[PDB]
Design a protein around this ligand. Structure first.
Ligand SMILES: [Zn+2]
Ligand SMILES: [Zn+2]
Lengths: 203, 290, 242, 204, 48, 105, 226
């Protein structure tokens, strides 16, 4: 790997569940997003697939979301495109058959296996993804464009770090840390046992 | 001498290089990239000034354009003639255009290398790799080419040394005016092959290089010296360093103080090696080996 | 501040190999150093005959000169990894108490106070940074040493002296003679060889006995000369591969 | 590399006490031979009237890259009527890594067990190895002296410290496996020091 | 000085004057030189 | 780079010996003009101060945490001018909230 | 091992705020444009600044610094913004964050206020007189002043128990600063430093702190620790 951009998204208060959306950058030039949740837990889904799943067909717009522009001649803007263009042609080992499928439905189907009956499969997996991807933005599934724009923001920040525009996030700094009391710690084990004690009589 | 010794790769002198995928020839008047279309002025001139050298017509339609840093060339005291001679001698596979002759500041020094079919045709051997990708291998090879200096020496700084020497009177006198070069990498062979350096006194901090070039005894002395250096001011007695070196050079080859090293010095000692680490693997190998 | 003005006007010209930032940092670090005359006011105030702290330091019983200088005169520049306090609070800041791009030495770890005088808050923070660095280094050093200690012990375990005074591993020689001298490490004392550095004429004047005109004394002096030459040749060679 | 080897290869012959059987040629002619033929050959006779042949292979040569070319060269040379004693083949260090050339070397040795065939890199002869400061004074001792030393110490040859036959100082001395080399080390604890090592098989 | 290397052997071999190994001679060389320096005829002129 | 008008998608850069040509998964391949000859350009320059700090320079006079100097603004005639030492080159760029940026454009 | 870390004397962990209300106010009020209205090209072309609340990019605004200052003034007022909200403005990138999370360390700090607006206005007038023939431009120039509103009388009241921190924050004397918002603050390490630079316009302080605040009780037990 080159670097890893990790973003744990939690909606509402600390007692809601969290989604650890990782954004890696492979040495070969591939950009993969790992949901690292209940579903797609170990699936390194290339970013452009994630963009098309939600309904982003045009590749030019897909690049735009990351770069927020497609005509400015900023050296930062330019270099970003070459990094991103090579990403499209990475030929990933997994998702290769689905790698260049214009049909939105086909892209969704391939994941379902890796996890109008097709509409149900799409209506299932896409809603699942909406619930799993960036919950803090919302889960109505009508804000998908906003989720994609924020994803592009993340790609832009990570790529800027690649180019050395900015330094990597400082771990020790307390600006990005938080101190949780007993309630947060208790709620953790409570979810496991309380559900466990509730599932046991379900059988 | 130190300036001469230091490795000067070609990439150090480039300001910006480009890959254009173009062919140069008076036939068909092949178009060029608009920014570099202005090169036509000295493109044809080079042939007029150097008629003996002309395009072999083996052009692979892959070309390199390289602007040179005049400031670096002046600083390093290297002339374009040496650069082109080294590039051509070490890369017969391509045709080199000296292009811009040395000028006053304002006229950039430019170089245009055209790749011949010889290198590209070889692609079929290993794989059907596209000629585009074998081209970037070639540009990297050109960038890494050594214009001057001993390979493997990043830096070289003159250092004041203190050394004794018996004078004519027969008195051992310490001399503090002696100067010497302290490099940043290790190449004993290169330093040996390069005059202006006393080949018989080359000293390296590398144990492997010393072993390879000089022998096991030199490697032993090098181990002693390096451990003593690592010890610092509060170092142990010398006999302990001697113990370390003698054990590590017992078999005629430098052996480690690790599982691999022990297995080479005391292979039959199954129990000792079991105690060190990996008891189950050692026991299995001992049992199968009997 | 003079160096700071030089930087402000752009008069800082780094030498080859150093960037302007590194050259400026080195120049400021050299500028901020006690003149070694700081000891004069300390010694003027204290009475060597009846000052307990000074007597403890000077006899070597405990303490050092930098200790006295810090206690009485001033702590001076804090140096971590032989460098000032690198900006880490923010992009340009070193602490919340200083502007983003501050030229003052106080912002990069210079303490103008003394322990007896009482440090201010930022000086205290810098001192604690230095202390935590030292403690961390000690702990990591010990932790790293232990593992290599065990590996070396098992590597060298089987080297035992034998009845020939050699060192061997189950009859397989590791040394023809322990330490090449066959001596215990705790039965040695440093001694000086006079003839090593003497000149030819000095050696003849000092050691050639001329009381009796006999060849035996010439032979003895020749033996001394041979030994001197052997010592020089061997240990001059040690210089040439060190 | 080539210029240094030419001047020092003959010193290696001189150190081994051999005598050259051909007249020395100028450096320009020597190099010229390397490009056209791919190798330069020097023949010397030992004290016992054995014949030692040295082959210096320049880079970008057919012999280095093709095993068949080496096979014909070695076979034809060995079939000669000279009373060969050793065949020294000096090559570029990358050549040593190549497996095919080495396979040519090993098979040839089997065909002629009596003859010794060795292959060395350039750097072994690009310097007067005995005169290096960091290399102690190696020396070969007769089997009788080594036997006396072992008998006085109740030792076996397998008990001594081992030194490879490819060791540059040993290569210059000419010792073969099963022989003993006496090394006069400089020691800091004690001024002098002497050890005896057992020459083992040369690597490669 | 000649018999010094025998310290690595018993006193029996010293009496019989049997051959001394070269490595033992080397081991004793340094102390031999020091003894020569510190017991030079000039130095020990008053010793009985 | 190039997006085929049939479908917005990256056009793989596969040159034909006679002249440059571009292709997509959908086809519609289009030749390459003179400007597309350049495939790989690299420039050896230290830092990206042109825009690496562009936004920072804009906001610097409005950031209270920034150092300041007693020099004067040529436009506003204020007694103080914000200072910043940006980059390993140690470039000192005095700035005012008015937009006046000394030592630079 | 000593991996444990002790909180400072004034350090106080913070409770989760009411993000819904602040988000409603932010999106409803002007100077903020919803993501629907703006476009990814639009922000770059117009140099718009993104606005984050609890890490959620709600929208964008024309000027980051102006909005951040306005909302900090609102917080000091206590009218619209809870005193514990973290208003962080990034200058390296045009961003305006609003964290109401749980687990943010917070410490009270005394606010340093000055009269720069008057200083600047008189500065313009003095320069104009320079162009004129008045030759008394200096009379228009006035000295800079930065001074906290803490008063010796109020300090006595605190010891008497009449005045509490909540009342200090109620007035504009004090406000809580988290390590995030600390990056936007220049703090005088002690009242001595604030007075030393009372009239210095080169160094304007945002807050002043009591130097004892950088130690916990365990460390504060030792006397003359410095
Ligand atoms: Zn297409
Ligand atoms: Zn202005």
């Amino acid at each position: 790997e080159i670097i890893r951009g990790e973003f744990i998204s939690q909606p509402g208060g600390a007692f809601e569940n969290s989604s650890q959306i990782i954004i890696r950058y492979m040495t070969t030039g591939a950009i993969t997003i790992e949901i690292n949740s209940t579903k797609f837990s170990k699936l390194r889904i290339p970013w452009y697939l994630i963009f098309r799943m939600f309904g982003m067909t045009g590749d030019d717009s897909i690049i735009e979301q990351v770069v927020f522009d497609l005509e400015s001649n900023s050296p930062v803007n330019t270099f970003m495109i070459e990094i991103l263009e090579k990403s499209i042609h990475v030929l990933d080992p997994i998702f290769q058959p689905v790698q260049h499928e214009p049909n939105r439905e086909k892209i969704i189907q391939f994941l379902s296996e890796k996890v109008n009956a097709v509409q149900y499969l799409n209506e299932r997996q896409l809603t699942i993804l909406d619930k799993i991807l960036l919950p803090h933005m919302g889960q109505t599934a009508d804000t998908r464009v906003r989720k994609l724009r924020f994803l592009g923001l993340l790609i832009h920040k990570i790529l800027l770090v690649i180019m050395n525009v900015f330094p990597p996030t400082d771990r020790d700094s307390y600006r990005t840390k938080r101190v949780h009391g007993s309630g947060v710690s208790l709620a953790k084990a409570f979810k496991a046992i309380f559900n466990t004690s509730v599932i046991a009589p379900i059988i | 001498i130190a300036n001469s010794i230091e490795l000067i790769t070609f990439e150090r002198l480039i300001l910006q290089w480009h890959l254009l995928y173009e062919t140069y020839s008076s036939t068909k008047k092949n178009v060029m990239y608009p920014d570099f279309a202005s090169d036509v002025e000295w493109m044809t001139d080079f042939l007029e000034n150097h008629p003996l050298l002309q395009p072999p017509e083996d052009i692979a339609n892959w070309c390199i354009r390289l602007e040179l840093n005049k400031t670096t060339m002046i600083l390093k005291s290297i002339s374009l003639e040496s650069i082109i001679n080294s590039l051509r001698a070490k890369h017969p596979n391509t045709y080199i255009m000296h292009s811009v002759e040395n000028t006053a500041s304002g006229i950039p020094i430019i170089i245009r290398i055209y790749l011949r079919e010889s290198a590209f045709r070889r692609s079929t051997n290993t794989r059907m790799a596209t000629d585009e990708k074998i081209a970037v291998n070639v540009v990297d090879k050109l960038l890494n080419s050594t214009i001057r200096g001993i390979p493997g020496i990043k830096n070289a700084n003159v250092v004041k040394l203190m050394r004794h020497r018996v004078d004519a009177q027969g008195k051992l006198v310490r001399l503090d005016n002696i100067y010497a070069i302290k490099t940043n990498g290790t190449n004993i062979f290169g330093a040996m092959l390069d005059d202006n350096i006393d080949p018989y006194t080359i000293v390296s901090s590398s144990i492997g290089d010393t072993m390879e070039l000089y022998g096991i005894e030199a490697a032993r002395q090098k181990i002693i010296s390096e451990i003593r250096t690592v010890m610092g001011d509060k170092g142990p007695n010398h006999r302990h360093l001697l113990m370390y070196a003698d054990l590590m050079t017992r078999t005629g080859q430098v052996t480690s103080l690790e599982k691999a090293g022990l297995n080479a010095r005391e292979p039959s000692n199954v129990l000792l090696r079991m105690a060190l680490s990996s008891p189950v693997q050692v026991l299995t190998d001992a049992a199968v080996d009997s | 501040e003079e160096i700071n003005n030089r930087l402000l006007h752009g008069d800082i010209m780094p030498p080859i190999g150093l960037t302007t930032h590194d050259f400026y940092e080195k120049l400021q670090l050299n500028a901020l150093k006690f003149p070694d005359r700081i000891l004069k006011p300390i010694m003027n105030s204290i009475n060597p005959e009846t000052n307990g702290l000074f007597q403890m330091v000077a006899t070597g019983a405990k303490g050092s000169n930098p200790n006295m200088i810090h206690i009485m005169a001033g702590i001076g520049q804090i140096e971590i990894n032989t460098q000032r306090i690198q900006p880490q609070f923010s992009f340009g800041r070193t602490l919340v108490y200083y502007p983003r791009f501050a030229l003052e030495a106080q912002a990069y770890g210079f303490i103008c106070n003394s322990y007896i005088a009482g440090l201010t808050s930022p000086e205290f923070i810098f001192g604690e940074m230095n202390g935590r660095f030292d403690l961390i280094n000690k702990a990591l050093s010990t932790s790293s040493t232990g593992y290599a200690n065990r590996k070396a012990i098992f590597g060298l375990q089987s080297c035992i002296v034998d009845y020939y005074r050699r060192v061997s591993i189950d009859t397989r020689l590791v040394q023809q003679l322990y330490g090449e001298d066959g001596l215990d490490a705790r039965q040695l004392e440093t001694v000086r060889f006079e003839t090593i550095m003497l000149s030819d004429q000095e050696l003849e004047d000092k050691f050639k006995y001329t009381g009796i005109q006999s060849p035996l004394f010439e032979e003895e002096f020749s033996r001394l000369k041979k030994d001197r030459d052997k010592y020089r040749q061997i240990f001059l060679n040690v210089e040439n591969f060190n | 590399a080539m210029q240094k080897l030419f001047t020092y290869i003959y010193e290696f012959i001189e150190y081994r006490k051999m005598v050259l059987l051909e007249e020395k040629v100028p450096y320009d002619k020597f190099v010229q031979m390397v490009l056209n033929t791919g190798f330069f050959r020097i023949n010397a006779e030992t004290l016992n009237h054995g014949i030692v042949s040295v082959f210096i292979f320049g880079a970008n040569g057919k012999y280095v890259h093709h095993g068949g070319d080496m096979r014909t060269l070695l076979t034809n040379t060995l079939n000669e009527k000279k009373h060969y004693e050793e065949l020294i083949l000096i090559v570029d260090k990358p050549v040593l890594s190549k497996k095919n050339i080495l396979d040519i070397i090993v098979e040839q040795r089997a065909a002629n067990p009596t003859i010794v065939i060795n292959i060395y890199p350039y750097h072994l002869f690009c310097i007067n190895i005995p005169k290096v400061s960091a290399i102690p004074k190696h020396k070969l001792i007769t089997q009788e002296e080594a036997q006396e030393f072992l008998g006085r110490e109740y030792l076996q040859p397998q008990d001594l410290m081992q030194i490879s036959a490819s060791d540059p100082p040993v290569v210059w001395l000419g010792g073969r496996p099963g022989d003993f080399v006496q090394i006069e080390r400089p020691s800091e604890t004690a001024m002098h020091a002497v050890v005896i090592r057992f020459i083992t098989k040369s690597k490669i | 000085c000649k018999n010094l290397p025998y310290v690595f052997i018993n006193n029996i071999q010293e009496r019989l004057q049997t051959p001394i190994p070269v490595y033992l001679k080397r081991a004793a060389a340094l102390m031999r030189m020091l003894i020569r320096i510190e017991l030079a005829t000039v130095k020990t002129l008053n010793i009985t | 780079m190039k997006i085929c008008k049939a479908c917005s998608s990256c056009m793989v850069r596969t040159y034909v010996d006679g002249n440059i040509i571009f292709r997509c998964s959908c086809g519609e391949s289009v030749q390459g003009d003179s400007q597309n000859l350049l495939v790989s350009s690299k420039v050896y320059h230290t830092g990206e101060m042109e825009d690496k700090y562009k936004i920072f320079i804009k906001n610097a006079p409005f950031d209270p945490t920034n150092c300041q100097i007693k020099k004067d603004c040529p436009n506003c005639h204020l007694d103080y001018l914000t200072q910043i030492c940006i980059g390993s080159q140690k470039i000192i760029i005095l700035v005012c909230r008015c937009g006046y940026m000394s030592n630079r454009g | 091992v000593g991996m444990s870390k002790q909180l400072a004397i004034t350090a106080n962990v913070c409770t989760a705020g009411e993000v819904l209300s602040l988000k409603q106010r932010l999106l409803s009020d002007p100077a903020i444009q919803q993501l629907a209205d703006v476009s990814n090209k639009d922000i770059v072309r117009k140099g718009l600044a993104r606005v984050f609340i609890n890490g959620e990019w709600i929208g964008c605004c024309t000027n980051a610094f102006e909005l951040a200052q306005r909302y900090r003034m609102f917080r000091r007022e206590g009218k619209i913004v809870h005193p514990h909200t973290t208003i962080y403005w990034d200058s390296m990138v045009d961003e305006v964050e609003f964290w109401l999370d749980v687990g943010r360390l917070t410490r009270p700090l005394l606010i340093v206020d000055n009269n720069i607006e008057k200083y600047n206005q008189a500065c313009y007038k003095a320069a104009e007189a320079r162009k004129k023939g008045d030759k008394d431009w200096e009379k228009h120039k006035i000295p800079f002043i930065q001074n906290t509103r803490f008063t010796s009388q109020m300090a006595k009241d605190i010891l008497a128990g009449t005045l509490t921190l909540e009342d200090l924050v109620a007035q504009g004397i004090c406000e809580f600063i988290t390590p995030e918002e600390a990056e936007n603050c220049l703090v005088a390490f002690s009242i001595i430093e604030l007075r030393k630079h009372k009239h210095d316009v080169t160094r304007r302080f945002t807050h002043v702190d009591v130097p004892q605040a950088i130690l916990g009780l365990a460390a504060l037990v030792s006397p003359y620790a410095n």
